[PDB]
Amino acid sequence: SSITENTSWNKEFSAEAVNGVFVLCKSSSKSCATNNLARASKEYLPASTFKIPSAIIGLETGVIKNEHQVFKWDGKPRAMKQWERDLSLRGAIQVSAVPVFQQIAREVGEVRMQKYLKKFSYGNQNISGGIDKFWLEGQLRISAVNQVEFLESLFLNKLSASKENQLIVKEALVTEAAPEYLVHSKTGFSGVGTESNPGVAWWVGWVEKGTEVYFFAFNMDIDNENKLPLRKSIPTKIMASEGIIGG
Amino acid sequence: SSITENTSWNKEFSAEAVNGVFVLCKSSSKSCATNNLARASKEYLPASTFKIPSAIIGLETGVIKNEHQVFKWDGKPRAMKQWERDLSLRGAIQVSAVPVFQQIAREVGEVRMQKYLKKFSYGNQNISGGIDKFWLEGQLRISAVNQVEFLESLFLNKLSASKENQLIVKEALVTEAAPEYLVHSKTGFSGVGTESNPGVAWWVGWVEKGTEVYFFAFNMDIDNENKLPLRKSIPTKIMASEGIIGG
Numbered sequence: 187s188s189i190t191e192n193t194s195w196n197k198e199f200s201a202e203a204v205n206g207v208f209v210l211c212k213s214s215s216k217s218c219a220t221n222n223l224a225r226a227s228k229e230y231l232p233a234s235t236f237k238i239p240s241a242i243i244g245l246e247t248g249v250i251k252n253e254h255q256v257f258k259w260d261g262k263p264r265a266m267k268q269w270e271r272d273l274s275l276r277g278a279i280q281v282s283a284v285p286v287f288q289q290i291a292r293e294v295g296e297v298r299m300q301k302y303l304k305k306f307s308y309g310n311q312n313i314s315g316g317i318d319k320f321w322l323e324g325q326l327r328i329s330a331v332n333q334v335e336f337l338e339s340l341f342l343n344k345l346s347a348s349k350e351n352q353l354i355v356k357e358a359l360v361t362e363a364a365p366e367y368l369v370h371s372k373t374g375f376s377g378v379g380t381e382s383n384p385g386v387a388w389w390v391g392w393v394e395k396g397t398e399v400y401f402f403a404f405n406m407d408i409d410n411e412n413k414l415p416l417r418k419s420i421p422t423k424i425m426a427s428e429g430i431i432g433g
Numbered sequence: 434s435s436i437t438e439n440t441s442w443n444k445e446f447s448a449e450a451v452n453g454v455f456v457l458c459k460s461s462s463k464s465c466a467t468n469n470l471a472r473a474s475k476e477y478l479p480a481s482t483f484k485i486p487s488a489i490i491g492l493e494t495g496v497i498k499n500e501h502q503v504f505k506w507d508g509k510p511r512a513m514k515q516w517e518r519d520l521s522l523r524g525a526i527q528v529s530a531v532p533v534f535q536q537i538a539r540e541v542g543e544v545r546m547q548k549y550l551k552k553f554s555y556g557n558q559n560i561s562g563g564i565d566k567f568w569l570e571g572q573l574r575i576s577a578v579n580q581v582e583f584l585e586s587l588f589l590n591k592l593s594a595s596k597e598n599q600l601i602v603k604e605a606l607v608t609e610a611a612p613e614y615l616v617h618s619k620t621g622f623s624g625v626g627t628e629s630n631p632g633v634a635w636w637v638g639w640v641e642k643g644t645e646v647y648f649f650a651f652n653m654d655i656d657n658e659n660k661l662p663l664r665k666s667i668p669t670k671i672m673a674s675e676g677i678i679g680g
């Protein structure tokens with residue numbers, strides 16, 4: 187990757203009082219821009235952004251049968267009422283259905299999971315702490331620049347998985363469609379943590395706009411869920427200002 | 434297929450004085466509804482809806498290299514200024530760029546084109562009238578019911594083409610995304626014909642909403658370009674009233 191620190195976006199962060207980073211790459215990870223070089227490479231819990239590799243792994247191992255898979259609710263009281271119904275793959279991704287991806291991880295298992303994270307060069311690749319908890323509460327960490335490299339590889343069909351599985355997950359990540367562009371994205375929020383050691387909120391993805399592609403990763407410190415809306419609005423304003431999406 | 438004629442949508446057509454048909458199927462073509470059974474099976478020129486099979490055929494023959502193929506603008510005047518730029522596959526479909534699709538048809542050739550439309554069971558499979566004009570001015574015709582059957586095969590990956598190429602075209606047809614659904618669609622419009630021999634406007638697609646799928650095909654007589662907006666608003670109004678899309 188090739189990254190250059192910026193000052194143009196700082197006011198989008200200091201107007202809202204946020205400590206975080208945005209990484210934005212035009213065409214490829216050979217042209218990235220960021221407001222904060224050091225934080226662009228610091229690794230944080232992926233939280234629900236780990237549903238992107240885990241759905242790819244779920245498909246590649248056969249645990250997710252194909253793009254038509256339905257994830258059927260068993261009837262076990264779920265932590266969220268939005269999790270209490272049958273979901274499609276896109277649906278389980280959208281509402282970050284925790285029990286759905288916990289079951290995928292247990293069916294995948296430790297060995298295969300370790301193997302696919304090494305092939306994908308995903309973060310510190312540390313999955314200790316429990317096979318169905320490592321991305322939520324365990325030791326896995328990944329940086330904003332590594333997220334971008336991972337998304338670009340998915341975008342190019344370069345991950346070690348069939349092209350068909352990569353295409354299935356990219357379609358499942360569409361979140362905004364317009365005549366000139368498609369936005370593929372995924373949020374994450376690790377929780378509030380403390381005020382002294384805050385959690386992290388994320389928003390990573392890519393925009394295909396005409397013949398161009400823009401990759402992006404955003405993360406921020408968050409100690410109050412009421413600050414959750416800035417995880418999308420800061421990056422959205424930045425991208426709207428570069429003429430990438432409508433915002 | 435299995436289709437039931439209905440009267441609860443006729444008000445949408447009569448209020449705008451349009452003569453047309455809407456075919457809407459839930460889950461599969463075994464469960465279709467329509468306002469007009471007879472017109473639902475009548476065959477019309479496909480016009481730009483023909484970009485769907487044409488994109489799949491271009492990919493399958495290798496004329497279109499992969500999903501990142503760019504269709505470069507040579508700088509010479511085109512019939513519409515929206516076609517006057519380099520275009521991605523989604524971009525070329527969205528603006529139904531004629532010259533891009535004429536060039537694709539010329540490289541696929543008559544023989545392969547006939548073979549694939551026999552494989553796809555696409556309408557009357559008559560490609561006479563010029564290898565680059567048949568779907569716009571030639572003898573090719575296809576009904577609303579046949580469009581639904583074809584889209585359902587594409588949805589299930591049952592067309593005789595790789596799953597990867599079918600998946601690429603499904604994602605290029607995405608036109609609306611919302612947390613609970615994606616809409617995949619494609620417009621069509623043959624020309625105004627006459628007051629007595631009207632042209633035809635289309636809107637075909639499918640909606641993935643949660644774990645459900647709804648396929649749709651809408652066509653109407655049109656003798657004036659100003660009536661073109663109805664081709665999306667009648668069907669949108671009908672789907673919104675059934676609770677499928679949020680409008």
Ligand SMILES: *C(=O)[C@@H]([C@@H]1NC(C(=O)O)=C(S[C@@H]2CN[C@@H](C(=O)N(C)C)C2)[C@@H]1C)[C@@H](C)O
Pocket residue numbers: 233234235282284322373374375376387388411412413414415
């Ligand atoms: C994954 O990160 C967790 C998951 N992801 C997020 C996300 O939007 O980043 C949610 S946020 C949570 C539900 N709605 C939020 C709200 O109250 N706001 C103020 C917007 C709180 C969810 C926590 C996955 C492990 O559950």
Ligand SMILES: *C(=O)[C@@H]([C@@H]1NC(C(=O)O)=C(S[C@@H]2CN[C@@H](C(=O)N(C)C)C2)[C@@H]1C)[C@@H](C)O
Pocket residue numbers: 479480481482527528529530531569620621622623634635661
């Ligand atoms: C293909 O059917 C013709 C093509 N399709 C359409 C269509 O939308 O039905 C268009 S005309 C319509 C108004 N002009 C277009 C544009 O303004 N949009 C991008 C909204 C849409 C065109 C006639 C094809 C052969 O070109």
